[PDB]
Amino acid sequence: SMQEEDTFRELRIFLRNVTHRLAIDKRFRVFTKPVDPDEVPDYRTVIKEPMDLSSVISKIDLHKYLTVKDYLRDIDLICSNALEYNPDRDPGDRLIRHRACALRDTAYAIIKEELDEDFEQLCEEIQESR
Protein backbone atom coordinates (compact mmCIF):
# COMPACT_ATOMS: atom_id res chain seq x y z
CA SER A 1 0.00 0.00 0.00
CA MET A 2 0.97 3.74 -0.27
CA GLN A 3 0.92 3.88 3.58
CA GLU A 4 3.46 0.99 3.64
CA GLU A 5 5.75 2.81 1.13
CA ASP A 6 5.53 5.95 3.40
CA THR A 7 6.59 3.70 6.41
CA PHE A 8 9.71 2.47 4.51
CA ARG A 9 10.57 6.09 3.35
CA GLU A 10 10.46 7.23 7.05
CA LEU A 11 12.75 4.22 7.98
CA ARG A 12 15.29 5.32 5.28
CA ILE A 13 15.28 8.99 6.50
CA PHE A 14 15.90 7.77 10.11
CA LEU A 15 18.79 5.41 9.02
CA ARG A 16 20.52 8.11 6.84
CA ASN A 17 20.46 10.52 9.86
CA VAL A 18 21.94 7.96 12.34
CA THR A 19 24.62 6.92 9.74
CA HIS A 20 25.64 10.60 9.06
CA ARG A 21 26.10 11.24 12.84
CA LEU A 22 28.46 8.14 13.05
CA ALA A 23 30.36 9.11 9.85
CA ILE A 24 31.26 12.70 11.03
CA ASP A 25 32.64 11.49 14.46
CA LYS A 26 36.51 11.70 14.24
CA ARG A 27 36.88 8.38 16.21
CA PHE A 28 35.14 6.48 13.37
CA ARG A 29 37.10 7.82 10.34
CA VAL A 30 38.75 4.37 9.82
CA PHE A 31 35.20 2.89 9.25
CA THR A 32 33.99 5.54 6.67
CA LYS A 33 35.37 3.88 3.45
CA PRO A 34 36.26 0.38 2.22
CA VAL A 35 39.81 -0.89 2.98
CA ASP A 36 42.17 0.00 0.04
CA PRO A 37 43.70 -3.15 -1.60
CA ASP A 38 46.98 -1.10 -1.84
CA GLU A 39 47.33 -0.71 2.00
CA VAL A 40 46.13 -4.30 2.88
CA PRO A 41 46.15 -6.82 -0.03
CA ASP A 42 45.78 -9.39 2.77
CA TYR A 43 42.42 -7.82 3.97
CA ARG A 44 40.03 -9.49 1.45
CA THR A 45 41.59 -12.97 2.05
CA VAL A 46 40.89 -12.78 5.85
CA ILE A 47 37.60 -10.77 5.86
CA LYS A 48 34.96 -12.52 3.72
CA GLU A 49 32.24 -9.78 3.93
CA PRO A 50 33.84 -6.28 4.19
CA MET A 51 31.50 -3.43 5.37
CA ASP A 52 31.89 0.34 5.97
CA LEU A 53 29.67 3.42 6.50
CA SER A 54 29.82 4.57 2.79
CA SER A 55 28.55 1.09 1.73
CA VAL A 56 25.78 1.33 4.41
CA ILE A 57 24.45 4.66 2.89
CA SER A 58 24.53 3.06 -0.65
CA LYS A 59 22.48 0.09 0.76
CA ILE A 60 19.89 2.41 2.42
CA ASP A 61 19.35 4.12 -0.98
CA LEU A 62 19.07 0.69 -2.79
CA HIS A 63 16.20 -0.25 -0.31
CA LYS A 64 18.26 -3.14 1.18
CA TYR A 65 17.03 -2.48 4.79
CA LEU A 66 13.29 -2.98 5.62
CA THR A 67 13.87 -3.02 9.42
CA VAL A 68 16.26 -1.37 11.96
CA LYS A 69 17.32 -5.00 12.85
CA ASP A 70 18.69 -5.60 9.29
CA TYR A 71 20.59 -2.21 9.47
CA LEU A 72 22.14 -3.18 12.86
CA ARG A 73 23.39 -6.51 11.37
CA ASP A 74 25.67 -4.38 9.05
CA ILE A 75 26.81 -2.05 12.01
CA ASP A 76 27.63 -5.32 13.94
CA LEU A 77 29.61 -6.67 10.86
CA ILE A 78 31.73 -3.40 10.71
CA CYS A 79 32.58 -3.98 14.44
CA SER A 80 33.18 -7.79 14.27
CA ASN A 81 35.40 -7.45 11.07
CA ALA A 82 37.68 -4.93 12.97
CA LEU A 83 37.87 -7.22 16.12
CA GLU A 84 38.81 -10.29 13.94
CA TYR A 85 41.36 -8.55 11.62
CA ASN A 86 43.13 -6.61 14.50
CA PRO A 87 43.28 -9.04 17.49
CA ASP A 88 46.81 -8.43 18.93
CA ARG A 89 47.99 -6.75 22.21
CA ASP A 90 49.85 -3.90 20.54
CA PRO A 91 48.55 -0.34 20.76
CA GLY A 92 47.47 0.07 17.07
CA ASP A 93 45.26 -3.09 17.34
CA ARG A 94 43.86 -2.10 20.78
CA LEU A 95 43.00 1.46 19.51
CA ILE A 96 40.95 0.17 16.45
CA ARG A 97 39.15 -2.46 18.68
CA HIS A 98 38.22 0.31 21.22
CA ARG A 99 36.91 2.52 18.32
CA ALA A 100 34.95 -0.47 16.79
CA CYS A 101 33.24 -1.18 20.16
CA ALA A 102 32.45 2.57 20.48
CA LEU A 103 30.87 2.66 16.93
CA ARG A 104 28.62 -0.33 17.85
CA ASP A 105 27.67 0.99 21.33
CA THR A 106 27.00 4.55 19.98
CA ALA A 107 24.67 3.21 17.15
CA TYR A 108 22.71 1.04 19.66
CA ALA A 109 22.42 3.97 22.16
CA ILE A 110 21.05 6.46 19.49
CA ILE A 111 18.50 3.80 18.39
CA LYS A 112 17.50 3.06 22.05
CA GLU A 113 16.80 6.80 22.67
CA GLU A 114 15.28 7.82 19.26
CA LEU A 115 13.54 4.75 17.61
CA ASP A 116 9.87 4.13 18.62
CA GLU A 117 9.48 0.37 19.40
CA ASP A 118 6.00 0.45 17.69
CA PHE A 119 7.57 1.89 14.44
CA GLU A 120 10.11 -0.99 14.36
CA GLN A 121 7.27 -3.57 15.03
CA LEU A 122 5.23 -2.10 12.10
CA CYS A 123 8.29 -2.45 9.72
CA GLU A 124 8.74 -6.15 10.90
CA GLU A 125 5.00 -6.92 10.28
CA ILE A 126 4.99 -5.36 6.72
CA GLN A 127 8.34 -7.29 5.89
CA GLU A 128 6.85 -10.63 7.22
CA SER A 129 3.68 -10.06 5.05
CA ARG A 130 5.73 -9.87 1.76
Ligand X SMILES: O=CN1C[C@H]2C[C@H]3O[C@@]2(Cc2[nH]cnc23)C1
Q: Point out which residues bind ligand X (CB under 6 A).
A: 30, 35, 39-40, 82, 85-86, 96, 114, 116-117
- When the beta carbons of 34 and 61 are compared against ligand X, the nearer one is 34
Name the 3-class secondary structure at 21.
helix
Least Å distance, CB 37 to ligand X, is 10
Angle between helical axes of 2-23 and 117-129 (0-180°, round to 10): 120
In our burial notation (b when 16+ CB lie closer than 10 A, e otherwise), range 94-129 reads eebbebbeebbebbeeebeeeeeeeebebbeebeee
Long-range contacts from 57-63, C-beta under 8 angstroms, 24+ separation: 57/16, 57/19, 57/23, 60/12, 60/15, 60/16, 60/19, 61/12, 63/8, 63/12
- When the beta carbons of 40 and 109 are compared against ligand X, the nearer one is 40
- When the beta carbons of 57 and 115 are compared against ligand X, the nearer one is 115
Least Å distance, CB 106 to ligand X, is 17
Least Å distance, CB 100 to ligand X, is 8
- When the beta carbons of 2 and 22 are compared against ligand X, the nearer one is 22
Least Å distance, CB 94 to ligand X, is 12
